[PDB]
Curated annotation (Swiss-Prot), chain C:
InterPro entries: Ntn_hydrolases_N, Proteasome_alpha, Proteasome_alpha-type, Proteasome_asu_N, Proteasome_sua/b. Keywords: Cytoplasm, Isopeptide bond, Nucleus, Proteasome, Ubl conjugation. Belongs to the peptidase T1A family. The proteasome degrades poly-ubiquitinated proteins in the cytoplasm and in the nucleus. It is essential for the regulated turnover of proteins and for the removal of misfolded proteins. The proteasome is a multicatalytic proteinase complex that is characterized by its ability to cleave peptides with Arg, Phe, Tyr, Leu, and Glu adjacent to the leaving group at neutral or slightly basic pH. It has an ATP-dependent proteolytic activity. This is Proteasome subunit alpha type-2. Disulfide bonds: none annotated. It comes from the Eukaryota. The 26S proteasome consists of a 20S proteasome core and two 19S regulatory subunits. The 20S proteasome core is composed of 28 subunits that are arranged in four stacked rings, resulting in a barrel-shaped structure. The two end rings are each formed by seven alpha subunits, and the two central rings are each formed by seven beta subunits. The catalytic chamber with the active sites is on the inside of the barrel. It comes from Saccharomyces cerevisiae (strain ATCC 204508 / S288c) (Baker's yeast). Its main location: cytoplasm. Transmembrane segments: none annotated. The keyword Ubl conjugation applies.
From Swiss-Prot, chain D:
Non-catalytic component of the proteasome which degrades poly-ubiquitinated proteins in the cytoplasm and in the nucleus. It is essential for the regulated turnover of proteins and for the removal of misfolded proteins. The proteasome is a multicatalytic proteinase complex that is characterized by its ability to cleave peptides with Arg, Phe, Tyr, Leu, and Glu adjacent to the leaving group at neutral or slightly basic pH. It has an ATP-dependent proteolytic activity. This subunit has a chymotrypsin-like activity. The modification Phosphoserine is found at residue 75. PROSITE patterns: PROTEASOME_BETA_1, PROTEASOME_BETA_2. InterPro entries: Ntn_hydrolases_N, Proteasome_beta2, Proteasome_bsu_CS, Proteasome_sua/b, Proteasome_suB-type. Present with 21800 molecules/cell in log phase SD medium. This is Proteasome subunit beta type-4.
Swiss-Prot record, chain E:
The 26S proteasome consists of a 20S proteasome core and two 19S regulatory subunits. The 20S proteasome core is composed of 28 subunits that are arranged in four stacked rings, resulting in a barrel-shaped structure. The two end rings are each formed by seven alpha subunits, and the two central rings are each formed by seven beta subunits. The catalytic chamber with the active sites is on the inside of the barrel. The keyword Secreted does not apply. The gene is PRE9. It holds the Pfam family Proteasome_A_N. Transmembrane segments: none annotated. This is Proteasome subunit alpha type-3. The proteasome degrades poly-ubiquitinated proteins in the cytoplasm and in the nucleus. It is essential for the regulated turnover of proteins and for the removal of misfolded proteins. The proteasome is a multicatalytic proteinase complex that is characterized by its ability to cleave peptides with Arg, Phe, Tyr, Leu, and Glu adjacent to the leaving group at neutral or slightly basic pH. It has an ATP-dependent proteolytic activity. Keywords: Cytoplasm, Isopeptide bond, Nucleus, Proteasome, Ubl conjugation. PROSITE patterns: PROTEASOME_ALPHA_1, PROTEASOME_ALPHA_2. It is found in: Cytoplasm; Nucleus.
From Swiss-Prot, chain F:
It comes from Saccharomyces cerevisiae (strain ATCC 204508 / S288c). The keyword Magnesium does not apply. Keywords: Cytoplasm, Nucleus, Phosphoprotein, Proteasome. Signal peptide: none annotated. This is Proteasome subunit alpha type-4.
């Protein structure tokens, strides 16, 4: 009866707490998509701020892990911030230990291993978040690596996360400077979700060769205007 | 049967113990925060449970370092525990570095601490929601931190029993004053909002406590509103009821 | 951590329930097989992708443990990943720091099985949900192929399969295996068995195959040391698998 | 201290000096620097004042515990190995035991006497005769001359008496005579009239 | 807290029994049969394995050397047994390092059984699901045959069987064992007892692990060809 | 560390784990001890007899310990008792008295009944012997709860109630068994309601009777 | 320096399909000679090990290596080889880098598979092809070996060479002597010989 | 389902173990605290298990300037008073400073709160009334197991404390202005505690009174010392 | 299950109440404090005639002027008494003076609630009797709940319910020491199931001059005759 309350095996060989963490990843009802250009990686995340008392510049599910790595999280923001702090510490520690910046895939494996530990030890619950790491690796180029509560991670050509991740995923499959990549991603998210975006409805992160950065509301409005033309 | 332990996901992916802590918060007295053009104002309703309480002596609002004010609703001892952690954190930041801790950094530290209390079944979630903020080198910041560890920046924040009416009044404030409120008029309006929200708890008398941290009025340090300004705000609130 | 008691305990029938459930998780995993020939061992598995936009090249289900030892799994992938990390670390610390050489296959298999049994008996941990097929070569035992179970039990095999279609694959290997098999014949039999096990597309991108065979001095990365032989573990590329499938 | 050991055809004879000196005065002139480890094993010790007795009783307690636990007696070889291991552990501890011991015992299964010399560093060696420190400087000539493997207990005692006489004549201290004990198949006995 | 999920492995039953120990014994009762026979001139260890593609010539899963003079037959979980066997080997080598003598069989058996008992009284962990048969020689008692179970009890035997069908095997041993048999007669007896207690229709060399200790003492773990020869000569073939 | 409170009070004031350890003791084999004027005689009713340990164990040269219940737990108790006796010899220059050793063993047993993460020993011990340089016989008993007491004659194990009734009707505290023969014959008669006999005498004179002597005693009875 | 407390020397030589290892037998306590039967050469299977230095350290290391090689044989089901044993010795010695044993170990043996003679000196491994020396007379041994040694000596010639080198180095060393033992090691047989030398 | 541990919230947000610890106080004997500007008074009704037994100590003295009275589990009160004495000791040692009553109350607050959020412990089953005098004057603090510490003019904790508390509320304006006449404040406290009796009357052995003030060190009256106040 | 340190909805610890009900099954112990001393008497309750009743130590010495009786799970009583003796000796070592009886009782009762995940509270109740210059002859009743009271006369154990009422009837401030002995013996004879005699009951007393002493079977028999 308690196989559903701690991460031990069920008689069917399943970890119900991990599956429920997967369920928790969609509580925020936010959809995100990541696309790689030939030179840059772009993450578009929905920015839903319904309360008018909120300061919108603080509502953010995109984190700058290091100079080159950015992370977009699908799930509750406390677990998202926990994962962000851990990833930042891991990146800084890798730089200290090995003399060079941690690659995006190494960090993704780092966090997936932590998730696996939470999956195997009973006193640790899984974090109910999905972590998408993006960077332009100095060896592998633009990179998307996505981690889930199960400790599973893999690299992606493009990826989408959220309640409507299926629609965006099939849309990208049908399709299959960084400003053009951003415009492509925004247009494709509009088409997949069937909803026009204002400058306040979107979060944009861009991983380039020298740095990862996030666009401001003014930059997002500029990209929306460019799409309008 | 998923609500008996802290770190258990329900089949829907919910943590029911955090929701129960939120219920405990909702049971508490109403506390608000208003971000003015150059500072932050904190106001809290202090219920007078008995005539034997010493007036102006059971202080609820707490200072962290010299520039951060914290007010909370729900389980007051949990709020004091959180504020003790926040003071330790501000001291550690001011020892490793030299600047006073920035408000967003302090908010992140408190959020990490509160979120760590939802990770294990050997610990209980915080039974408070904390409105905190202050003035740093980047201006004024206002945050509300929930039992889940979630926190956001706010133009105006409210928790407690009369949180809905206080939120409506703060929304009216944000609508009517896009230019940015002034610290003194913010104190007056905080008094007004607390008095308005007390109507949901009219069965008992209450004492109004206000504090503020303004770049101009208080020189960027958190100070309690006392004396002439406090009485002026009280009279403004009393008049604004009628 | 207040979990200091065992989560795996005996039942009134003598069963260890968590180990049985880990075995059930293994049986639901993707089929992976290993065949031992006279001059090599071949381990093969299906690469099942979660999304068509996933880069399956980044997910390696076959791992090098030592230059002459490789591993494949069926079951829970993250468990295999952490087990592979621990196995490489143990193969270095417990053996190569002491004796200056990589362990023989059986000793590494015993160390991995020890790691698995520790998860079986220690407090506050579930067992690993993976069975590993570990293929290796050592100077004194030659080529060997070992299956390690979640309980920590390991067994040497001439040929075996684990996972979703392990029963049919094992029957086919019983039909096809013989003690005079060459490495190329073993690879052909492995490809046929995996063809019978794989549901959808059967090609070099959906199949991961590695061999323990001849030493590869071209993969050593340096020359000038006559006694440094070169790795025997070799993961076949998608191009090589496609070539061996076109002339199937 | 002065410790002599001599293994003869059927027994081991140990002689230990009687004097205890601290600073300006000879406090005791009848000390027994031996401990019975087992009914057929005896250990005599020399070295630093407080370390010798402490180490000896620790060893004796350990050997007694083994004997009770197994309802069996350790062989003299095993006892000497255990003592050597203890001294080797001590020599690299926070404060080593500065104790030199002679282990004389009778192996009831081999029916042979055994003598082992172990110094403070932990160098063990099986000897027909032994002495620690400067003691062998005044005795080794005589044993090298007159020792035979087939010597009886009486001849060994005469040789020990001659060695003690030589030590009394040329060593520049007064060790106040020796206490003589014999280990054989009948157990451990003391020679008072030496 | 974790109190809800604790199974309380180290507690008594109202009848004074230990649930987990009894369940581990039940587990071993389904393991392959291992037999030890102490003859006048040595000890015989025989174990029944429990596929065509299995590398039988390499598999050593029930008989292990702990020493130059001590061997164990294993019934139960093989990985727990491997842990215990490593500890036993290290303990025997520690004894040899300390005393320059080979460890007596009883001391080693007692140490292993104490390790087993420790998991039964404290720690909250499950018992080892292993039963051992120790065949050993030492100068004190000569050839000795002990057995130990998850509870940590160890007893000395002239002939003993562990694993599946212990009752039938012990009945056969009681019927046919003599104190004055030679090692060859003991080997024959072990093969006959295994044949009449196996659940399979026939007993073949691939299903058998065999070991003897004979006098200096010599441990011989039989190769498959030697097992085949002994099967043919005994008459089971 | 595992520290769950396994031995706790039931609503009726009982510690169930200690009661169940007592049941485990009552399922033990036997330990009959008959104390006389000069004798303390301890007895019990394809196995290899050479290497199967005798139930009576020497804690020191003068104190022996018989037990009943779980043999594996008894091994740990006996090891602790022997180590304690050796340490007492080492540090207080004196061999343990029977009461001191009994107190130490009962203290270990009691400690295991109120420590977290452990279960009580399912062992009751009959501790017999003589104090150093003394001659009055001692026969103590310890139980899983930690209770220790002195007895003229006591039995533990299966048939303990019947054998204790037999002793209560045959042993008389007015006139204890006068000779070693009387001690042994009373013990054998109690065990006859296979026999092993150990006689504990002062000055560390502890001997187990041969099978011939025991056969003569049985035939006389 | 604890190595000079006890004295003693060990020399190993390679021949044609054979190795020789030789040592003196003196166990000394500074100038005083205590034992003439302290053999410093031990073997674990077919791998021979000579240890010079502090005698208690010699005994401790012999016990440790017997322990480790026994566990190796139990785990591996095969006897350790001279190269693997050399790695084991190096790792064991550096396991006590700041608590070192005051020893000089010399490995001699023939690899059972390849059949090639193997000798080694030391934590840093000196895997020489001609000779290894160790002890208080290492300079005398170096002179004698560098003068006398020639490659591919037959076992009899190798015995004579190593014996003469050892005897003449021990004659010029105060703390070495009181007898000598030579092991002529081949794949099929190992011969142990005690040498007649000066007893001063 | 939710009352078995202090680490669990009820579906309505309640902590049941803390409430049970409060009920532990409600089973205890009534003690009354009240203060004027110059003096703070503790009045306690000591309880005896048997008429052959003595009356359990209700009032504990910390130092010359501070003391407390307890209602509920006496060992918990002793633990808390030992911690309070340690805090005052630390203040005196490190700063040569008398610990303020409010700061000591907050230290008790933190110590009590630590047992309501972590598993394994239990809430303290005692309530305390702490009176003290410092540079800011007379102080009366009510401590609760939940961690709540309150500064009051007057208060009563224990069984039937509601009558005493109601009387103190009615008398508030009178006794807060008593000022420099300690005997009258003690008298008012005695009337307050007498308002909480049901059957037994205040006797020489029953009544225990403590006082601390401007020029009054913390003194406890027991036995015949309270006969003038009965 | 439930935690050992849990409160009941009525504000009482479960394990403490269970331990008190465990105490209720113990052998009876009676203590009477007078101006000349304190008399402690216990019911031996030997389980068998072969049990040597002189080995039952249910009255022990804590210090020269402090002794106590025990009732309930007397195995826990030994640990409590060892702690008490260590406390008294440590007091004499640290302060060069004998410990006060009330201070000794406090030191003992400090262990009472020091349990939780000690696995359980003690299952024994003590009657601590002692003398000192500060307070004279004193008698305390220590409980596993951590509470203790000073008693003029107290009875604990199986027969405490009627014994306490009888002590209420009989005790007065002018009782002499011999009257206290007779009263203790009378109450024991009243409440003991067995016929009271010098082999199934024990007496002890604490006086300033002679300290803590246990009455021998001879002297106890002479006192029993007086009834």
């Amino acid at each position: 009866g308690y196989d559903r309350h701690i991460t031990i095996f069920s008689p069917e060989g399943r970890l119900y707490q991990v599956e429920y963490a997967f369920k928790a990843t969609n509580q925020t009802n936010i959809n995100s998509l990541a696309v790689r250009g030939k030179d840059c990686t772009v993450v578009i995340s929905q920015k839903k701020v319904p309360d008018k008392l909120l300061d919108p510049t603080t509502v953010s599910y995109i984190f700058c892990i290091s100079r080159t790595i950015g992370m977009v999280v699908n799930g509750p923001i406390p677990d998202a911030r926990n994962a962000a702090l851990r990833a930042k510490a891991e990146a800084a520690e890798f730089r200290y230990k090995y003399g060079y910046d941690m690659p995006c895939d190494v960090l993704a494996k780092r966090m997936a291993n932590l998730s696996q530990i939470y999956t195997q030890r009973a006193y640790m619950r899984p974090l109910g978040v999905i972590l998408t790491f993006v960077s332009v690796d100095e060896e592998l180029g633009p990179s998307i690596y996505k981690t889930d509560p199960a400790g599973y991670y893999v690299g992606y050509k493009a990826t989408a996360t959220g309640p409507k991740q299926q629609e965006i995923t099939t849309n990208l499959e049908n399709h299959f400077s960084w400003e053009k990549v951003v415009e492509f991603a925004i247009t494709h998210m509009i088409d997949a979700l069937g909803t026009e975006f204002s400058k306040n409805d979107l979060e944009v992160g861009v991983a380039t060769k020298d740095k990862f950065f996030t666009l401001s509301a003014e930059n997002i409005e500029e990209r929306l205007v460019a799409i309008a033309e | 049967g998923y609500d008996l332990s802290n770190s258990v996901f329900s089949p829907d992916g919910r943590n029911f113990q955090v929701e129960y802590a939120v219920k405990a918060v909702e049971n508490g007295t109403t506390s608000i925060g208003i971000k003015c053009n150059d500072g932050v104002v904190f106001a809290v309703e202090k219920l007078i449970t008995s005539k034997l309480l010493v007036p102006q002596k059971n202080v609820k609002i707490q200072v962290v370092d010299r520039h951060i004010g914290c007010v909370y609703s729900g389980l007051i001892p949990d709020g004091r525990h959180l504020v003790n952690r926040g003071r330790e954190e501000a001291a550690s930041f001011k020892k490793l570095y030299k600047t006073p801790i920035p408000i967003p950094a302090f908010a992140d530290r408190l959020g990490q601490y509160v979120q760590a209390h939802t990770l294990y079944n050997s610990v209980r979630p915080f039974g408070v929601s904390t409105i905190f903020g202050g003035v740093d080198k980047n201006g004024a910041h206002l945050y509300m931190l929930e039992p889940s560890g979630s926190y956001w920046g706010y133009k105006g924040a409210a928790t407690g029993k009369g949180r809905q009416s206080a939120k409506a009044e703060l929304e009216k404030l944000v609508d009517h004053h896009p230019e940015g409120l002034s610290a003194r008029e913010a104190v007056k309006q905080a008094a007004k909002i607390i008095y308005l929200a007390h109507e949901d708890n009219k069965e008992k008398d209450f004492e109004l406590e206000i504090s503020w941290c303004s770049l101009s009025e208080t020189n960027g340090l958190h100070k309690f509103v006392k004396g002439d300004l406090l009485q002026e705000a009280i009279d403004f609130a009393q008049k604004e009821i009628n | 951590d207040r979990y200091s008691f065992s989560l795996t305990t005996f039942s009134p029938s003598g069963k260890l329930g968590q180990i049985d459930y880990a075995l059930t998780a293994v049986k639901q995993g993707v089929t992976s097989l290993g065949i031992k020939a006279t001059n090599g061992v071949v381990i093969a598995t299906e690469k099942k992708s979660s999304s068509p936009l996933a880069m399956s090249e980044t997910l390696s289900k076959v791992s090098l443990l030592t230059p002459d030892i490789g591993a494949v799994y069926s079951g829970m992938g993250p468990d295999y990943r952490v087990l592979v990390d621990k196995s490489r670390k143990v193969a270095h610390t417990s053996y190569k720091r002491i004796y200056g050489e990589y362990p023989p296959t059986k000793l590494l298999v015993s160390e991995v099985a020890k790691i698995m049994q520790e998860a079986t008996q220690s407090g506050g941990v579930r067992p690993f949900g993976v069975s590993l097929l570990i293929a290796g070569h050592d100077e004194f035992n030659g080529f060997s192929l070992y299956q390690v179970d979640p309980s920590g039990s390991y067994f040497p095999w001439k040929a075996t399969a684990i996972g979703k279609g392990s029963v049919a694959a094992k029957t086919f290997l019983e039909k096809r295996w013989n003690d005079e098999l060459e490495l190329e014949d073993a690879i052909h039999i492995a490809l046929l068995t995996l063809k019978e096990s794989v549901e959808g597309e059967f090609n070099g991108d959906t199949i991961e195959l590695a061999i323990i065979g001849d030493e590869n001095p071209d993969l050593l990365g340096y020359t000038g040391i006559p006694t440094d032989k070169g790795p025997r573990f070799r993961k076949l590329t998608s191009q090589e698998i496609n070539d061996r499938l076109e002339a199937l | 201290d002065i410790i002599l050991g001599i293994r003869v055809q059927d027994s081991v004879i140990l002689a230990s000096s009687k004097a205890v000196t601290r600073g300006i005065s000879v406090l005791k002139d009848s000390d027994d620097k031996t401990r019975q480890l087992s009914p057929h094993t005896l250990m005599s010790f020399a070295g630093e004042a407080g370390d010798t007795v402490q180490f000896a009783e620790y060893i004796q307690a350990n050997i007694q515990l083994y004997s009770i636990r197994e309802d069996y007696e350790l062989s003299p070889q095993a006892v000497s190995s255990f003592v050597r291991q203890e001294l080797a552990k001590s020599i690299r501890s926070r404060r080593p035991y500065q104790v030199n011991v002679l282990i004389g015992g009778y192996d009831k299964k081999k029916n042979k006497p055994e003598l082992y010399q172990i110094d403070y560093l932990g160098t063990k060696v099986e000897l027909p005769y032994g002495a620690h420190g400067y003691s062998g400087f005044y005795t080794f000539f005589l044993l090298d001359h007159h020792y035979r493997p087939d010597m009886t207990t009486e001849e060994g005692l005469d040789l020990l008496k001659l060695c003690v006489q030589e030590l009394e004549k040329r060593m520049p201290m007064d060790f106040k005579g020796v206490i003589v004990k014999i280990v054989d198949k009948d157990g451990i006995r003391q020679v008072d009239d030496f | 807290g974790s109190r809800r999920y604790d199974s309380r492995t180290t507690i008594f039953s109202p009848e004074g029994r230990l649930y987990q120990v009894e369940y581990a014994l039940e587990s071993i009762s389904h393991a392959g049969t291992a037999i030890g026979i102490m003859a006048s001139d040595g000890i015989v260890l025989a174990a029944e394995r429990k596929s065509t593609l299995l590398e039988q010539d390499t598999s050593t899963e029930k008989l292990y050397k702990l020493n130059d003079k001590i061997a164990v037959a294993v019934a139960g979980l093989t990985a727990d047994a491997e842990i215990l066997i490593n500890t036993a080997r290290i303990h025997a080598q520690n004894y040899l390092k300390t005393y320059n003598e080979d460890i007596p069989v009883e001391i080693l058996v007692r140490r292993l059984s104490d390790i087993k008992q420790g998991y039964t009284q404290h720690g909250g962990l499950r018992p080892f699901g292993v039963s051992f048969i120790y065949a050993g020689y030492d100068d004190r008692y000569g050839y000795q045959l002990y057995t130990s179970n998850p509870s940590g009890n160890y007893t000395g035997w002239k002939a003993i069987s562990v694993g599946a069908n212990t009752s039938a095997a012990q009945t056969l041993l009681q019927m046919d064992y003599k104190d004055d048999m030679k090692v060859d007669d003991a080997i024959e007896l072990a093969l006959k007892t295994l044949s009449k207690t196996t659940d399979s229709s026939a007993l073949t060399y691939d299903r058998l692990e065999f070991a003897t200790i004979r006098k200096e003492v010599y441990q011989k773990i039989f190769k498959p060809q030697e097992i085949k020869d002994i099967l043919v000569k005994t008459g089971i073939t | 560390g595992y520290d769950r409170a396994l031995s706790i009070f039931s609503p009726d004031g009982h510690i169930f784990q200690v009661e169940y350890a007592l049941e485990a003791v009552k399922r033990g084999t036997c330990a009959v001890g008959v104390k006389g004027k000069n004798c303390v005689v301890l007895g019990c009713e394809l196995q290899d007899t050479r290497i199967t340990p005798s139930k009576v164990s020497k804690i020191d040269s003068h104190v022996v310990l018989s037990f009943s219940g779980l043999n594996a737990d008894s091994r740990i108790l006996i090891e602790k008792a022997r180590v304690e006796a050796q340490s007492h010899r080492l540090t207080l220059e004196d061999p343990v008295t029977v009461e001191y050793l009994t107190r130490y063993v009962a203290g270990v047993q009691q400690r295991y009944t109120q420590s977290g993460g452990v279960r009580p020993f399912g062992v009751s011990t009959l501790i017999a012997g003589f104090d150093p340089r003394d001659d009055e016989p001692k026969l103590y008993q310890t139980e899983p709860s930690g209770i220790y007491s002195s007895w003229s004659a006591q039995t533990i194990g299966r048939n303990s109630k019947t054998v204790r009734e037999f002793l209560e009707k045959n042993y008389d505290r007015k006139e204890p068994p006068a000779t070693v023969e009387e001690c042994v014959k009373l013990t054998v008669r109690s065990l006859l309601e296979n026999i092993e006999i150990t006689v504990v005498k002062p000055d560390s004179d502890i001997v187990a009777l041969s099978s011939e002597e025991i056969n003569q005693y049985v035939t006389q009875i | 320096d604890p190595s000079s407390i006890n004295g003693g020397i060990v020399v190993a030589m390679t021949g044609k399909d054979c190795v020789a290892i030789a040592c003196d037998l003196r166990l000394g306590s500074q100038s005083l000679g205590v034992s003439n039967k302290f053999e410093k050469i031990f073997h674990y299977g077919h791998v021979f090990l000579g240890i010079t230095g502090l005698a208690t350290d010699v005994t401790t290391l012999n016990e440790m290596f017997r322990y480790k090689t026994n566990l190796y044989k139990l785990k591996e089901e095969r006897a350790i080889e001279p190269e693997t044993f050399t790695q084991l010795v190096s790792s064991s010695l550096y396991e006590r880098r700041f608590g070192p044993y005051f020893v000089g170990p010399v490995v001699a043996g023939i690899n059972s598979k390849s059949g090639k003679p193997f000798i080694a000196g030391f934590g840093c491994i000196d895997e020489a092809k001609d000779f290894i020396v160790s002890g208080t007379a290492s300079d005398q041994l170096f002179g004698m070996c560098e003068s006398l040694y020639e490659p591919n000596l037959e076992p009899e010639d190798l015995f004579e060479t190593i014996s003469q080198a050892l005897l003449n180095a021990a004659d010029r060393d105060a703390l070495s002597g009181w007898g000598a033992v030579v092991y002529i090691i081949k794949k099929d047989e190992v011969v142990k010989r005690y040498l007649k030398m000066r007893q001063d | 389902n939710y009352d078995g541990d202090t680490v669990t919230f009820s579906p309505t947000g309640r902590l049941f173990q803390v409430e049970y610890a409060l009920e532990a106080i409600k089973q205890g004997s009534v003690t009354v605290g009240l203060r004027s500007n110059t003096h703070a008074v503790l009045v306690a009704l000591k309880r005896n298990a048997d008429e052959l037994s003595s009356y359990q100590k209700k009032i504990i003295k910390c130092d010359e300037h501070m003391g407390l009275s307890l209602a509920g589990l006496a060992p918990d009160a002793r633990v808390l008073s030992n911690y309070l004495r340690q805090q005052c000791n630390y203040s005196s040692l490190v700063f040569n400073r008398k610990l303020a009553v409010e700061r000591a109350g907050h230290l008790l607050c933190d110590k009590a709160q630590k047992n309501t959020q972590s598993y394994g412990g239990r809430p303290y089953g005692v309530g305390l009334l702490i009176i003290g005098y410092d540079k800011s004057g007379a102080h009366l603090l009510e401590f609760q197991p939940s961690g709540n510490v309150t500064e009051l003019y007057g208060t009563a904790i224990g069984a039937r404390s509601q009558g005493a508390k109601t009387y103190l509320e009615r008398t508030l304006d009178t006794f807060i202005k008593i000022d420099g006449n300690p005997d009258e404040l003690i008298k008012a406290g005695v009337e307050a505690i007498s308002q909480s009796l049901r059957d037994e009357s205040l006797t020489v052995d029953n009544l225990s009174i403590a006082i601390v003030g401007k020029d009054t060190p913390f003194t406890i009256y027991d036995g015949e010392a309270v006969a003038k106040y009965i | 299950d439930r935690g050992v340190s849990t409160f009941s909805p009525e504000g009482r610890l479960f394990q403490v109440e269970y331990s008190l009900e465990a105490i209720k099954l113990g052998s009876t112990a009676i203590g009477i404090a007078t101006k000349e001393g304190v008399v402690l008497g216990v019911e031996k309750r030997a389980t068998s005639p072969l049990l040597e009743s002189d080995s039952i130590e249910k009255i022990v010495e804590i210090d020269r002027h402090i002794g106590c009786a025990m009732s309930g799970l007397t195995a826990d009583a030994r640990s409590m008494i060892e702690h008490a003796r260590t406390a008294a000796v440590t007091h004499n070592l640290y302060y060069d003076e004998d410990i006060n009886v009330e201070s000794l009782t406090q030191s003992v009762c400090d262990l009472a609630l020091r349990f939780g995940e000690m696995s359980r509270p003690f299952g024994v109740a003590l009657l601590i009797a002692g003398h000192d210059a500060d307070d004279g002859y004193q008698l305390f009743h220590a409980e596993p709940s951590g509470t203790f009271y000073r008693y003029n006369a107290k009875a604990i154990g199986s027969g405490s319910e009627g014994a306490q009422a009888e002590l209420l009837n009989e005790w007065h401030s002018s009782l002499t020491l011999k009257e206290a002995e007779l009263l203790v013996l009378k109450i024991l004879k009243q409440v003991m199931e067995e016929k009271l005699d010098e082999n199934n009951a024990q007496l002890s007393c604490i006086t300033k001059q002679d300290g803590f002493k246990i009455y021998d079977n001879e002297k106890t028999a002479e006192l029993i005759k007086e009834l």
